[PDB]
Amino acid sequence: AHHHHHHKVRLDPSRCVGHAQCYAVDPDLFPIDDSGNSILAEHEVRPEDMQLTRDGVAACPEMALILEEDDADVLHRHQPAGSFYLPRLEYSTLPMAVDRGVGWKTLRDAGPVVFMNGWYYLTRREDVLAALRNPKVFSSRKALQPPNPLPVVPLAFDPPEHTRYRRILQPYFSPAALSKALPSLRRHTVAMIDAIAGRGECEAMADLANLFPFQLFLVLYGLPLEDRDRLIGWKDAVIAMSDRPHPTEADVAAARELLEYLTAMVAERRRNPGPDVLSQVQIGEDPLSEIEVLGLSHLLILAGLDTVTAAVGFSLLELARRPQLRAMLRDNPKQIRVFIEEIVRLEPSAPVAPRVTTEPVTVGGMTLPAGSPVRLCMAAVNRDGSDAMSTDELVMDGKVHRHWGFGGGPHRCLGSHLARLELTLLVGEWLNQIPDFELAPDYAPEIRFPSKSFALKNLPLRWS
Numbered sequence: 001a002h003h004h005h006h007h008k009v010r011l012d013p014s015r016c017v018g019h020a021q022c023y024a025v026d027p028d029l030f031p032i033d034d035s036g037n038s039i040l041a042e043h044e045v046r047p048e049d050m051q052l053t054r055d056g057v058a059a060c061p062e063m064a065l066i067l068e069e070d071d072a073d074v075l076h077r078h079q080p081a082g083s084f085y086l087p088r089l090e091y092s093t094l095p096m097a098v099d100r101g102v103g104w105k106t107l108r109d110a111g112p113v114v115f116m117n118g119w120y121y122l123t124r125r126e127d128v129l130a131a132l133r134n135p136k137v138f139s140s141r142k143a144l145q146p147p148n149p150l151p152v153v154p155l156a157f158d159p160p161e162h163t164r165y166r167r168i169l170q171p172y173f174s175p176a177a178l179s180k181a182l183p184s185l186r187r188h189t190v191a192m193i194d195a196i197a198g199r200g201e202c203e204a205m206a207d208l209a210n211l212f213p214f215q216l217f218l219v220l221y222g223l224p225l226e227d228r229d230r231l232i233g234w235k236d237a238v239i240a241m242s243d244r245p246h247p248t249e250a251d252v253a254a255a256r257e258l259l260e261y262l263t264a265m266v267a268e269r270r271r272n273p274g275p276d277v278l279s280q281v282q283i284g285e286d287p288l289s290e291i292e293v294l295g296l297s298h299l300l301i302l303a304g305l306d307t308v309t310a311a312v313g314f315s316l317l318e319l320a321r322r323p324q325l326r327a328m329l330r331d332n333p334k335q336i337r338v339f340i341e342e343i344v345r346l347e348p349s350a351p352v353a354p355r356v357t358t359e360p361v362t363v364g365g366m367t368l369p370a371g372s373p374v375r376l377c378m379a380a381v382n383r384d385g386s387d388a389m390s391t392d393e394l395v396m397d398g399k400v401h402r403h404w405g406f407g408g409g410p411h412r413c414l415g416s417h418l419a420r421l422e423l424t425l426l427v428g429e430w431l432n433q434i435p436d437f438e439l440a441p442d443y444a445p446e447i448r449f450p451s452k453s454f455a456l457k458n459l460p461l462r463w464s
């Protein structure tokens with residue numbers, strides 16, 4: 001018994017991509033810099049800190065924190081294809097509409113690699129996590145730019161270009177940076193909840209979730225608040241047309257009007273820079289060009305808003321069904337954060353990441369030729385059952401869980417800190433003013449499937 005070995009924890013710097021989940025477990029044990037990346041220095045773990053240290057190590061989706069036995073001494077020194085049968089499924093008949101767990105289980109069980117409708121889906125954690133970390137082989141640039149001259153900054157870039165974009169942009173998107181915005185975001189969120197509360201009922205998607213992200217976006221980036229509904233309209237049309245081989249005249253015009261609006265905004269920020277993000281990325285040691293900030297602005301609008309909308313809906317749905325959970329969470333920011341992580345783990349708004357391979361690669365004993373289109377199944381991995389943080393159930397055990405709902409590897413969601421901030425604000429201020437509410441009768445929650453959204457079609461709520 002009494003040979004109790006002590007432990008040390010260290011950071012593998014090549015694995016950290018700044019998820020900052022470790023910091024959420026304990027900010028003093030797991031410090032981060034102004035870009036949201038761990039600055040933990042290797043050290044002996046105090047016996048009283050062992051459980052929180054294990055929790056932080058368990059929270060990192062890149063496995064970048066390593067706990068090892070502190071056992072160095074004078075003797076023990078520490079040095080400083082086989083598969084030819086391709087499974088095929090039809091995407092559109094996966095059982096997704098009612099229960100994502102049943103849907104991803106159907107896909108997972110067909111095999112490590114499943115061909116559906118032109119794409120190779122990688123369904124298994126080993127392959128997905130490895131592929132996310134291997135941008136040389138699994139390229140984002142080859143997959144994620146429409147043949148559109150406006151660069152999709154930073155989504156459609158590989159290292160080293162991608163690395164520069166992340167170095168430049170992460171200081172503006174970190175927990176430290178966004179904390180300065182929180183009084184503003186909280187004030188606007190309180191106002192939105194107050195508009196809802198006095199009604200006694202809503203259809204939460206159309207009435208709140210569809211509006212809340214763009215409202216806060218305008219506040220964050222200093223855009224005119226009266227432009228919200230025009231901008232939502234443009235966003236909705238440009239999202240809808242991305243799937244269309246032959247966009248309508250209304251589609252083309254919507255895209256043109258959004259481009260013209262953002263072009264004028266970006267040019268004005270370059271002429272008269274203020275203490276805002278879109279101004280400041282355009283000056284300093286390594287400036288972004290106007291076209292780069294324009295591409296970034298389009299990406300934030302088209303990818304950072306409907307994702308939060310969808311997560312709002314799932315958050316309110318689950319609270320509506322669970323009265324005792326509502327009561328625990330109210331005025332409980334630490335457990336609200338636990339809850340929001342479970343919602344993103346179980347109902348990630350972008351459940352797969354597309355890539356194109358640059359060289360042959362063997363996955364599941366199967367070799368995929370160079371140039372293969374590949375979808376990495378984050379959502380399925382989040383539910384693969386391989387540990388207690390990976391079930392199909394909502395798990396409220398007081399701990400921050402690792403998951404891949406915000407992606408992983410270098411493209412890990414740039415807005416992940418913001419998404420968590422907005423979702424925890426919403427849940428907290430909803431429960432503050434609307435502690436008890438229920439689903440309207442005869443409601444069955446479903447997503448629209450197959451489609452470009454994994455969000456609830458609607459969410460009818462009622463209260464007194």
Ligand code: HEM
Nearest residue numbers: 154155300304307308311349353406407411413414415419
């Ligand atoms: C719950 C809400 C959100 C979820 C589930 C989500 C999910 C994701 C995922 C999985 C990726 C990686 C895609 C890939 O590897 O190809 C990603 C990338 C990205 N997301 Fe988020 N997102 C959310 C909210 C936001 C917000 C609020 C913003 C900013 C306003 C945003 C901006 C971005 C950007 C700029 C990237 C590209 C990062 C890069 O390629 O380096 N997202 N998102």
Ligand code: F3S
Nearest residue numbers: 016017020021022060
């Ligand atoms: S910030 Fe922390 S959660 Fe992981 S990716 Fe870096 S050690």
Ligand code: NI
Nearest residue numbers: 001002003004
């Ligand atoms: Ni002993």
Ligand code: NI
Nearest residue numbers: 001002003004
């Ligand atoms: Ni002894």
Ligand code: NI
Nearest residue numbers: 004005006047
């Ligand atoms: Ni001792």
Ligand code: NI
Nearest residue numbers: 005006007069
């Ligand atoms: Ni040990």
Ligand code: NI
Nearest residue numbers: 069071072078
């Ligand atoms: Ni050792």
Ligand code: NI
Nearest residue numbers: 003005069071
């Ligand atoms: Ni030993």
